[PDB]
């Protein structure tokens, strides 16, 4: 009864401070493109989402410098509306203990963005905690329905190191490093650093040819098997393991070069990682918006019309493809002999 | 009480007519292993504690210089086995308790591998049935799951891929 | 048993036709036009915007009706049927008869080419104040005689509404001193959304039947110092970063213009009547 009043208080002006300065996106234009394709949350939901981005960005206590609406996770009892942000002042991250692989701090790699979440649009936003690589790997072993409560337990076996807030945060890390992508040629990657730079000599591609996965490129760093966007090779005194020597895809790698899904029964051709999605039935329709659609993470979509491109996730959080099996127990330790 | 040193191993215990008969604390000075326990005819027999070079600690029964009978082994990763031994391996009825995942395996063992019984998790969810044994890595083969959060049981088996194949729908049940 | 022929036509504008190369015509972004008008809350909506874009594609790609450019004029509400009006250019032909107006009682149905307009029936239609009957062959006015039927009166109303309320944002079209035509500017950066709702932002692009590219600021005001164009806004709060803006016509109620970002549009949706007192 109070959440409806908050979501209506998103609209208009508050009746009788100073607002915060931030940089959002054209969330109404994002809703226009995704309504053009047929994916996303619908056009009235994206307007309330734009006003929730407005409320999160104007709050002076939060101190946000940039907001992007990540998307929506479906849970059993409540949903999750997820907003990705950068803050004006990063929180303190505790140092990881000895023996474990270290953490990517705030503003670097998998913790480059602070994720806020609510259960309704305009409701109370709770900052999700930072993510660790052990949570990413333990989330890779899991396949769970979310419940909508940020304090529910996840699983006993496999041992996940947190509650549902940490599991949602690991899902956001995995989906963000794999499905948020930019049109090809819109950015250029530095050959020294890892940061991007928007080039000025880019031409938009006309209409339906932005439904080709050769025309998109991952704008975020690839999330390795270790649980880090940049693998951590420990200091040696034929030594390093396979997880440390994983030099993955190059920056701004296209969606044509993603690994296909494992082959399902009935067809020996592996399904592609990305499918086209079209706005119009006819090829000859003027001013078409087009985009690609993720098959590994179903619910993740991308869209482009001119210089205006979106990427958005609306899903259950489930990785698909049939490459999940229930986890076996750890092998019981052999004795001292061990032939 | 003939404390005999070796060119170096250090025995400290009683000897009856040259050989070890009684309690004695033999120490391997090459590998670091020690044994404090009983002796028959210069060999390990009866009971005694054995610590190994990989810091595994055995406390239990001995028949002729090999782990037999009932015992308690403690592994270098903190895993604890309690139950029947044969031929120096896990064989019979036993309980293997992990340290990390805190789950445990209770039931029939065969040649160091778990071949039948229950595998209960931390929260009370279990898989009961026939496991892979020593040929596999004690992987589950055929039986039924109970998950306690959903309170659902399902009978099925595992395919060669490793994926669960249930013979029917899940159903509301108890913890077997 | 009801016939389906209107609905067969309206579904025939969708998809590919079941089977000649179609010609290359010039149209505005009509889906963006429907988006701008739905942000401002004027026009015909989004669904009919899709229908209008598809029907204008059917008009434009017709190889037998070789068309230089298609534009949607608007909708004339009538007593018995309505009029969807499309203006075309075809690759006598100067002045108010520069564009040809094709009307249809429903989108996708059979199109009727309106006759060319003469200034005599323009002056004759400026006296009368009638409601359209939705049939192009009907007697118009008895005691003041009108020279044509309702097709001619509809063409005269279209000519007057065109000369009054068909605009474009300022510093977008320049008049060529040689050819006498409107040359679009390539480096036209549009203003903000709320800055579109001023009459200084828009200029005419039609002959007066004010000059050619005269702004909407310099119009004949209504009595009481009332400006002839009122603002319309996409948002009630001025803190929404990206929004739209435009103008309503007070002289011709139903004639709107608008702009969001770099997408601008104009339409007339009305009854054809002018907001002016009728003297007999």
């Amino acid at each position: 009864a109070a959440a409806a009043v908050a979501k209506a208080s998103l609209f208009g002006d508050p009746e009788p401070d100073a607002p915060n300065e931030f940089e959002c996106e054209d969330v109404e234009g994002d809703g226009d493109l995704l309504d053009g394709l047929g994916v996303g949350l619908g056009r009235q939901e994206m307007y309330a989402a734009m006003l929730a981005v407005k409320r999160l960005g104007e709050d002076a206590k939060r101190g946000v410098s940039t907001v992007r609406f990540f998307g929506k996770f479906f849970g059993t009892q409540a949903d999750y509306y997820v907003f990705e942000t950068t803050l004006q002042s990063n929180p303190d991250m505790p140092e990881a203990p000895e023996g474990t692989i270290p953490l990517e701090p705030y503003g670097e790699g998998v913790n480059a963005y602070i994720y806020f979440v609510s259960n309704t649009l305009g409701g109370p936003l709770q900052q999700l905690p930072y993510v660790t690589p052990e949570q990413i790997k333990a989330s890779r072993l899991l396949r769970r329905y979310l419940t909508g409560r940020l304090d529910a337990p996840v699983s006993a076996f496999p041992a996940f190191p947190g509650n549902e807030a940490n599991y949602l945060r690991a899902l956001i890390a995995r989906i963000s490093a794999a499905t948020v992508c930019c049109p090809r040629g819109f950015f250029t990657a530095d050959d020294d650093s890892a940061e991007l730079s928007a080039n000025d000599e880019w031409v938009p591609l006309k209409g339906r040819e932005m439904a080709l996965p050769v025309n998109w490129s991952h704008r975020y760093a690839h999330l390795k098997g270790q649980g880090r966007t940049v693998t951590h090779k420990r200091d040696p005194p034929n030594f390093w393991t396979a997880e440390e020597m994983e030099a993955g895809p190059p920056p701004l790698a296209t969606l044509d070069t993603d690994a296909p899904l494992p082959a399902a029964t009935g067809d020996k051709v592996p399904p592609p990682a990305w499918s086209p999605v079209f706005a119009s039935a006819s090829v000859t329709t003027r001013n078409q918006v087009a985009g690609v659609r993720s098959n590994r993470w179903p619910g993740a979509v991308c869209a482009c019309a001119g210089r205006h491109f979106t990427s958005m996730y609306v899903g259950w959080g489930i990785k698909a493809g049939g490459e999940w099996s229930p986890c076996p127990p750890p092998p019981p330790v052999p004795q001292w002999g061990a032939p | 009480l003939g404390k005999m040193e070796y060119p170096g191993d250090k025995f400290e215990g009683t000897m009856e007519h040259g050989v070890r008969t009684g309690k004695g604390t033999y120490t391997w000075g090459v590998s670091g292993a020690v044994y404090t326990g009983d002796y028959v005819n210069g060999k390990k027999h009866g009971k005694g504690k054995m610590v190994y070079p990989d810091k595994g600690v055995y406390e239990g029964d001995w028949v002729e210089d090999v782990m037999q009978g009932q015992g308690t082994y403690t592994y270098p990763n903190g895993d604890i086995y309690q139950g029947a031994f044969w031929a120096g391996k896990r064989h019979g009825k036993g309980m293997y308790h992990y340290k990390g995942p805190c789950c445990q395996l209770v039931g029939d063992w065969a040649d160091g591998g778990f071949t039948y019984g229950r595998w209960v998790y931390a929260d009370g969810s279990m898989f009961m049935g026939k496991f892979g044994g020593a040929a596999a890595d004690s992987k589950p083969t055929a039986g039924s799951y109970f998950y306690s959060s959903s309170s659902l049981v399902q009978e099925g088996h595992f395919a060669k891929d490793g994926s669960w194949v249930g013979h029917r729908d899940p159903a509301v049940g108890k913890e077997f | 048993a009801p016939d389906a022929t209107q609905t067969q036509a309206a579904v025939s504008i969708f998809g590919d036709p079941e089977l000649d190369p179609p010609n290359e015509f010039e149209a505005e972004n009509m889906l963006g036009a429907a988006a701008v008008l739905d942000c401002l809350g004027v026009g015909l909506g989004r669904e009919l915007g899709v229908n209008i874009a598809l029907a204008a594609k059917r008009i434009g790609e017709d190889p037998k009706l070789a068309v230089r450019s298609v534009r949607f004029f608007g909708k004339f509400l009538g007593l018995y049927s309505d009029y969807f009006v499309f203006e075309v250019a075809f690759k006598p032909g100067k002045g108010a008869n520069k564009f040809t107006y094709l009307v249809c009682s429903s989108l996708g149905g059979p199109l009727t080419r309106l006759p060319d307009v003469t200034p005599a029936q323009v002056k004759a239609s400026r006296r009368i104040k009638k409601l359209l009957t939705g049939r192009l062959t009907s007697h118009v006015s008895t005691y003041p005689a009108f020279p044509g039927n309702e097709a001619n009166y509809l063409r005269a109303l279209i000519a007057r509404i065109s000369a009054a309320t068909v605009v474009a944002p300022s510093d977008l079209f320049s008049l060529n001193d040689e050819t006498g035509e409107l040359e679009r500017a390539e480096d036209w950066e549009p203003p903000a959304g709320r800055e579109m709702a001023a009459p200084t932002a828009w200029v005419h692009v039609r002959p007066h039947l004010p000059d050619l590219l005269a702004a909407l600021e310099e119009d004949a005001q209504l009595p009481g110092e009332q400006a002839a164009w009122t603002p319309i806004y996409s948002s009630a709060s001025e803190a929404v970063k990206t929004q739209a803006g435009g103008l309503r016509s007070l002289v011709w109620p139903g004639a709107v213009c608008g702009g969001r970002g770099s997408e601008w549009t104009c339409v007339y949706v009305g009854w054809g009547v002018k907001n002016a007192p009728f003297v007999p």
Partner: protein, 254 residues
């Protein structure tokens, strides 16, 4: 048979007539109308319409009622109106006295859009001046339109044993939706037989799409009042978009 007219279906079926509402205003109405319906304790509350203003801040008007009873041979609905200029928060829109109704009916032209604006108007001093607030003129125009049109389908409401006008849940449908005799005023009694065909001839227009089953009724006397009746789904609804003025030149237009 519907219970209450649905705003999304009204906007969908009447967007062909130009009777459209802004994207923000539609999104805001979807949240604001149930809040004000619960808050004001009204059984019904729908968007009555929108009135165009000079500054652009249009007046969204909603109406609602609890009881609808037969009094003096007419179906009186005790309607409370509400206004907003953003579609988010709804104010009261208080009623207007009878002399002030006669005075505000002489204010022509489109409203200004400032609720704290007073139109000065002079009389003969039986000179006298009177400042009439713009909310009063707004309530006057909404009352004149609502007593003029208020279109429901004929026999869509029934008169119960408690002498109240309740919706006929067994409503079969309009037999001929292309006719004016299938539609009546809301303030006409069930079983009286005062349809829209018994108005002044030439104040209404009906366009019926016989295939899809959707009829649209348009008021000629108040250009801007629209009504739809979809016969396959048995769903009707009405809306007023435009300034609140009356077409006083209707005998010259036909």
């Amino acid at each position: 048979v519907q219970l209450e007219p649905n705003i999304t279906l009204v906007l969908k079926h009447l967007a062909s007539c130009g009777a459209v509402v802004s994207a923000e205003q539609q999104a805001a109405l979807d949240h604001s109308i149930p809040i004000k319906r619960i808050e004001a304790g009204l059984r019904s509350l729908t968007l009555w319409g929108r009135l165009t203003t000079l500054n652009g801040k249009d007046y969204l008007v909603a109406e609602g009622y609890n009881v609808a009873s037969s009094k003096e041979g007419a179906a009186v609905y005790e309607t409370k109106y509400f206004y907003s200029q953003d579609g988010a928060r709804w104010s009261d829109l208080q009623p207007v006295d009878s002399e002030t109704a006669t005075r505000c009916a002489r204010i022509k032209g489109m409203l200004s859009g400032d609720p704290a604006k007073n139109y000065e108007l002079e009389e003969k001093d039986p000179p006298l001046v009177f400042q009439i607030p713009e909310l009063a003129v707004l309530r006057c125009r909404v009352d004149a339109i609502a007593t003029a049109t208020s279109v429901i389908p004929t026999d869509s409401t029934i008169l119960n044993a408690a002498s109240q006008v309740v919706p006929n849940r067994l409503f079969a449908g309009a037999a001929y939706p292309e006719k004016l005799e299938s539609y009546q005023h809301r303030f006409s009694l069930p079983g009286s037989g005062v349809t829209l065909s018994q108005d002044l001839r030439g104040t209404w227009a009906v366009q019926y799409d016989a295939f899809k089953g959707v009829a649209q009724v348009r008021s000629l006397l108040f250009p801007g009042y629209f009504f739809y009746y979809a016969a396959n789904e048995l769903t009707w609804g009405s809306l007023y978009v435009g300034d609140g003025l009356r077409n006083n030149d209707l005998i010259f237009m036909l």
